Amino acid sequence: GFNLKVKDLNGSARGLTQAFAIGELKNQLSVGALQLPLQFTRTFSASMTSELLWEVGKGNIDPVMYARLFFQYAQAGGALSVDELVNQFTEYHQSTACNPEIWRKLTAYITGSSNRAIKADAVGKVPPTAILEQLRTLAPSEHELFHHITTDFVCHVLSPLGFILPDAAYVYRVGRTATYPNFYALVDCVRASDLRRMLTALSSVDSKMLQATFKAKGALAPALISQHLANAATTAFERSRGNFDANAVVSSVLTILGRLWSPSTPKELDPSARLRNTNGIDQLRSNLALFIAYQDMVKQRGRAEVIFSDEELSSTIIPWFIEAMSEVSPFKLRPINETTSYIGQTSAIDHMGQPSHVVVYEDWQFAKEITAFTPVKLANNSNQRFLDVEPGISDRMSATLAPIGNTFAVSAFVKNRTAVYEAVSQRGTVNSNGAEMTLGFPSVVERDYALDRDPMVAIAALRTGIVDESLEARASNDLKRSMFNYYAAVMHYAVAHNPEVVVSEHQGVAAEQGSLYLVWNVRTELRIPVGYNAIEGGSIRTPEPLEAIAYNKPIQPSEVLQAKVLDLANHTTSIHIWPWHEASTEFAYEDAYSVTIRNKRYTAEVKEFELLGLGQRRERVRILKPTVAHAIIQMWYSWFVEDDRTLAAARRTSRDDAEKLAIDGRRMQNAVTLLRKIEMIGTTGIGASAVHLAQSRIVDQMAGRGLIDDSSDLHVGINRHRIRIWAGLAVLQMMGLLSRSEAEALTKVLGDSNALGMVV
Amino acid sequence: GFNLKVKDLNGSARGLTQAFAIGELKNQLSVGALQLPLQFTRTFSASMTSELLWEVGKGNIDPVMYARLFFQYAQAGGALSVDELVNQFTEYHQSTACNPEIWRKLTAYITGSSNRAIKADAVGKVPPTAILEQLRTLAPSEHELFHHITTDFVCHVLSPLGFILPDAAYVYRVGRTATYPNFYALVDCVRASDLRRMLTALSSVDSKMLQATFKAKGALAPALISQHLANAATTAFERSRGNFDANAVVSSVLTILGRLWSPSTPKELDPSARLRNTNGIDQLRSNLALFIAYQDMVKQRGRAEVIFSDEELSSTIIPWFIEAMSEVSPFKLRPINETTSYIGQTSAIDHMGQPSHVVVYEDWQFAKEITAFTPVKLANNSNQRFLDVEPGISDRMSATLAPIGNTFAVSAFVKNRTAVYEAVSQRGTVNSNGAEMTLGFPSVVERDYALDRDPMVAIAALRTGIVDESLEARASNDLKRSMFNYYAAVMHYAVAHNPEVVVSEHQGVAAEQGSLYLVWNVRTELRIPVGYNAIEGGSIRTPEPLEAIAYNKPIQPSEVLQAKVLDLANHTTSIHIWPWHEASTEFAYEDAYSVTIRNKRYTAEVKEFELLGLGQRRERVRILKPTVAHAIIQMWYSWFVEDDRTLAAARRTSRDDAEKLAIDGRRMQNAVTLLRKIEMIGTTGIGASAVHLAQSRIVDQMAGRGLIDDSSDLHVGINRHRIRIWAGLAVLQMMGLLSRSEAEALTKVLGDSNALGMVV
Questions:
Q1: Are the CB atoms for A633 and A446 separated by under 8 Å?
Q2: Cα separation, A416 vs A399, whole angstroms
Q3: If exposure means fewest CB atoms within 10 Å of the residue's CB, which of A424, A450, A700, B25 is most exposed?
Q4: Is B84 within 8 Å of A616 when comparing Cβ atoms?
Q5: A560 phi/psi in degrees, rounded to 5
Q6: Are the Cβ atoms of B101 and A133 closer than 8 angstroms?
Q7: Nearest CB neighbour to A391, from listed B87, B102, B245
């Protein structure tokens, strides 16, 4: 719901300027006239709308599965980066598997003793749960993943089928991922494929005959294999070397992709025609995600250095950069036509006419359900849980969720967004401060909400283009990451609709090297209010992906991009669990409706279980945070607030008396559409249940303190609208949909303009 | 012992107005003229007078027994609600039964080892107490019930007869229950039948062939059945699904019954002729308890919404609402004739005459015994106790108990209450503020005393109709629960003697729809002093069940309703135990008699063991609270205290000199009857022992401090009456019969009016 004035970008959105991303924040902006072309066929993007539960097998040690989960751990909630996550494992894998001391202790634990050795055709099966139980005390890692990966390693080498009872069920949640590959995200991919080869080494064609070596001649003396497996596992580890530094890998391959993108290819080195012949690199230089990645890297690094083992080495070794990106990563390769399918565009117009208001959107479908579960601990010290989903809370809310989807539908947003801007007798203009552009991108906003950050802090950073130097490492890094996903998503839509583009170097500030940027071209009608550009002949050249977009013509989105619920029901009921806590929330709410009647104030306080009509209260249950559903309402919220914010300061700067009466128009007008929307929600399964409770407790209070006859005032026009809005704000707050901090400022918007028509 | 003036109900007792219960507290009262008829054949009521000890078998897992006990736990003292008690268990049951880690832990403990697995036809039996001992350290739940249901689950599947020597005897107390079904109690019934199917799934034809599958071919390898039982107990769990929400069940079914109770049936949605034919709905729409429950729901919720799974679903599902109600619940179905059998009625009269005083009462019989037991702990950390009942303490008290019943008998109460109210030469009247009605209901009062609340606070809540918002949730929730039982008990009696009735909708407070209320018809004498109503034609229609009751004629109760003692003697002497502690009381008492003689003050202090004539003192023994016997005396107390209270504000507000001399008459008059009663108990096995001990220590004090000859004054008329009354209050307190706070307020009453005739 980010609204921006296309004329002044530096003022309106500094953060979305390409100019910003390449590192020129000065009044000088990228030059509309310069050199070399390119066409992007393909890119790397993750999936939207996927909530999946993935089992971890008996064995089998799936090397891609783990590597994916590692990503999901670093992504969906912060634990360091997948880079820092792997070398925590390597240190772990060394301290345990290569340590024969640990192998003695647990082989002793299975049966029967560390000293006594028995061939023992008598010994029966053992559960994986018992070995994991042992391992939590032996190698106390924070990330419990590590304990499963070693486990099913031993269970792969332990299956003559006698000793290992192949019965357990364990599941992990694969959720939404940030959509586009920031530079370090690529390094995370190379580093993750470092893990694939690492694990696919552990289960091997020689680990399978390791079973077959001890399958002969029968049951054998136990005491040996503790030292054996320890060395068996050491051989598998030493065989996989860190080798090429994953950072340096990405560093250089991008460096060279920039060298053949750039109009300045200096004398000394331009890529070999041999590495130019290397498979897929034709498809690599045509990759948009890799391009934006370059801009990022060179912004932070300010140089790019090469291992110089090429022209030969990385043409032969590695393409495996390609393999690293293709298989392991959540970012899998797509045709650029189909990456923007969920994006729509619509223009307002004047008489001639130029667009007054242009709105870009993602078609999203709301709902379907809101799952409510209660965690159950099987063993202390571990995050292992059954999640019993208790419905009837979920069903209750979900029924109340249905009307919200209809009334907040994105479809309805663009409608109520475009039709507002018109003023009496047209006529335009460059006046009113020009042609507005607003773009909702719930895909982005969900991310701030998943990481427990305020979407409004990133957005603020977009208009201004500066971040607070004070805040701590994990906070700014989360902000910068978020501030990126915006820029990225903009340039994919911008490019997919104008694939023909020009690459040009920059002078540089120093000048040291420079960053490569993009320029578009577009043909249109003659006279432009819109942000400065010629247009000189009905076609126009622009550096900024926003300008490129403002000039397109209305678009119908191809796909609906329906968000989906996680299935707790079918799986989790029988199964164990992943890092759930940071992804869910304690289910509790308190709110109070107060009102003054006849110069006396009554206050009713209300609780969540009272709102759902049950007793008494269950503190143990939690709600799975509905970040996507939340992000859509944010789009409404951020329009309402940020407009009122901008219109107030607009009225001060407007000296003209005829304009101020126009400004003051839009304010009250959209203040009431906000009111009419919430007030509608105030009547629903919860809303009416809420109003009843509030009113009910007030009258009981009015009965004791005095006469009841005052209750007639609750049925007056104004108090009825009052109580209703409150309910609406209360229902949204008690679901994952409205933060109290944001709903508080929502009320202020509703009150900053008086914004109540009594209207008979 | 609640007394009320039938003229003004709102003022005198608001809490018992139907108008209050359907939620109309405004000056407006229900309209005597409106539409549709109905007749109630049946109701749902609990049992009075039952103290039972229930043994828990080896196995066999009686699914109904446990589900009944859950109720008894949540009832007999508050632990949340039986709804919250159940999902504590389901969480427990996941933590234990689905967890193969724990099955391993205990099977290793029973036999023979965790690593080595031996079929072992040699290995012998183990006692259930030992497996339960293990479970107390493994799954440390506060409610020890859970350990038995799991324990004897394994003892059910473990009978090749080899491993379990299944020998122990454990018992639970099934006590008094609230008599009538509040709305959430119905929710509690559905949720308890959810427990029935839950457990009846556990013991199965497939869990026993589980024995029969492994009965072959003989003793088998141990390590296996550890992972096996876990999935076996798991399959049975996933097989019983929560499915339908218990709250949703009741909400919707009552809603539709209301749709066919009401004269207002909108075209749009009225019950289908198909679900109109659905079996049982005939006796359901004719069921009173459901109706008073309906009123409850709509007061608190303020709407009735339907799962709308009908027209189909509730004809097929649920009737199962009925099954939930039939077996599991303590509320089992009764014909409305036989529910009010213990309720009698009697009127006082004036000359013509209309009733001045009408008293409704429950016939109750006292005694027989008062049990005194000393707990014995077999193991720390558990509530398991032998309770050795040491009699001769019990017998000593019971002997003193026999006269108390005689002097406080309900029989005696109704006499001394009706025969007092007459005034000289009749004649009435509507003057004096009309025709009083008092109704004793020990059944209701005992609930407050079992739950360690002052019955007098609920009583307060009846007259005013407001609860203090200050007191904590559980407190008001106990208060509100109690206030329901009063209202409920009235309307079962009102209806049973006047079944022809009319249902009518109400204008509404919101107004959303409205609550259906009741109107009666009754035949009588010509001119009415009694609370406003037409009467127009020798018959009269009234909304309030109290007015309806006044117009009936004296009734003899059918059944005696004798209260019974719990038998500790026969069972517990050999057996372990339930939640006894909150249900018993530490046995210790201290008291002191003080008197001033010749401007000197002497005091003798007395202790409990001294009063029973033994030495030295045993602190370890406890008393089982006689909550019912206490509740009966409450009937007296609340008359004595609360009348003296109202007669005081009566003399102030009385200007008339002829009226005030009458008021002050009633006060001393019944004051002596209180006095004569207490003094009477003062002569008993204990009472006389008290007097002797007190006087003895005083004289012993008079020898040292000075001359003994002053002791002659202790035998004077006045000091003799003093000490006797004291002993009476002292004997009642040292049994469960008088709270010191109320015994103090009884003295204030006895002294507020001078209240001593010397009378030779």
A1: no
A2: 25
A3: A424
A4: yes
A5: -80, -30
A6: yes
A7: B245
Tokens coding A534: 């010629």
Q: Which of B94, B95, B104 sits opposite A127 (nearest CB)?
A: B104
In contact, A41 and A336? CB cutoff 8 Å? yes
In our burial notation (b when 16+ CB lie closer than 10 A, e otherwise), range B159-189 reads: beebbbebebebbbbbbbbbbbbbbbbbbbb
Give chain B's largest Cα–Cα span. 100
Whole-number Å distance between alpha carbons of B758 and A257 = 118
Pairwise CB contact (< 8 Å): B91 & A693: no
Alpha-carbon span B504 to A514, nearest angstrom: 85
Picking from A388, A575, A614 by the largest number of B CB atoms within 10 A of its own CB, the best residue to mutate is: A614
Query: Which alpha helices (DSSP H) does A419-469 contain, by range?
Result: 442-450, 455-464
The H or E element that residue B343 is part of is strand B343-347
- Which residues fall within 8 angstroms of residue A595, CB to CB, at 6 or more apart? A601, A602, A698, A714, A719, A722, A723
Task: Please check whether residue B5 is in contact with residue B434, taking contact to mean a CB–CB distance below 8 angstroms.
Answer: yes
Contacting residues for A693 by C-beta, under 8 A, at least 6 apart: A604, A606, A610, A611, B302
**Whole-Å CA distances, A628 to A171, A195, B496:** 23, 31, 58
> Is the distance from CB of B36 to CB of B263 less than 8 angstroms?
yes
Domain boundaries, chain A: 1-760
Please indicate whether, in this complex, the C-beta atoms of A688 and B469 are within 8 angstroms of each other. Answer: no
Among B116, B222, B302, whose Cβ lies nearest the Cβ of A111? B116
Q: How far from B157 is each of A101, A629, B149, B154, CA to CA, in Å?
A: 41, 48, 13, 5
> In terms of C-beta density within 10 A (0-12 exposed, 13-18 middle, 19 or more buried), how is residue A382 classed?
middle
Query: What distance in Å separates the CA atoms of residue A45 and residue A177, rounded to the nearest whole number?
Result: 10
Tell me which chain A residues have a C-beta less than 8 angstroms from the C-beta of B25. 699, 703, 708
- According to DSSP H, which parts of A215-311 are helical? 225-239, 246-259, 273-277, 281-284, 288-301
CA of B721: how far to CAs of A725, B668, B714, in Å?
70, 17, 10
Contacts of B256 by beta carbon, 8 Å cutoff, 6+ apart: B271, B275, B306, B310, B314
d(CA A440, CA A651): 26
From chain A residues 375-394, the ones with a CB under 8 A of any chain B CB are 376-379, 386, 388, 390-392
User: Considering only CA atoms, which of B23, B28, B3, B25 is closest in space to residue B13?
Assistant: B3
Q: Hey, which bits of A309-367 come out as E strands?
A: 333-335, 343-347, 357-362
Resolution of the determined structure in angstroms stands at: 3.6
* CA distances in angstroms from A517 to A21, A70, A246, A521, A661, listed in the order given: 9, 33, 26, 14, 43
CB proximity A619 to B under 8 Å: no
Amino acid, res. A390 = E
Helix, strand, or coil (residue A693): helix
Angle between helix axes B410-418 and B627-653 (nearest 10 degrees) is: 10
* Rounded Cα distance, B631 and B454, in Å: 11
CA angle at B278 for the pair B277 and B279, rounded to the nearest 5°: 110
Residue B398 tokens, joined: 């019971």
3-state secondary structure of B167: coil
Beta-sheet pairing, B601-607 with B357-362: unpaired
Length of chain B: 760
Dist CA A732 CA A633 (whole Å): 10
Phi–psi pair at B206, nearest 5 degrees: -85, -20
> Looking at the complex, does the CB of residue A7 fall below 8 Å from at least one CB of chain B?
no
Q: Do A127 and B473 touch (CB under 8 A)?
A: no
Tell me whether residues A125 and B245 touch, CB distance under 8 A. Answer: no
Record the tokens describing residue B595, joined without a space: 């008197």
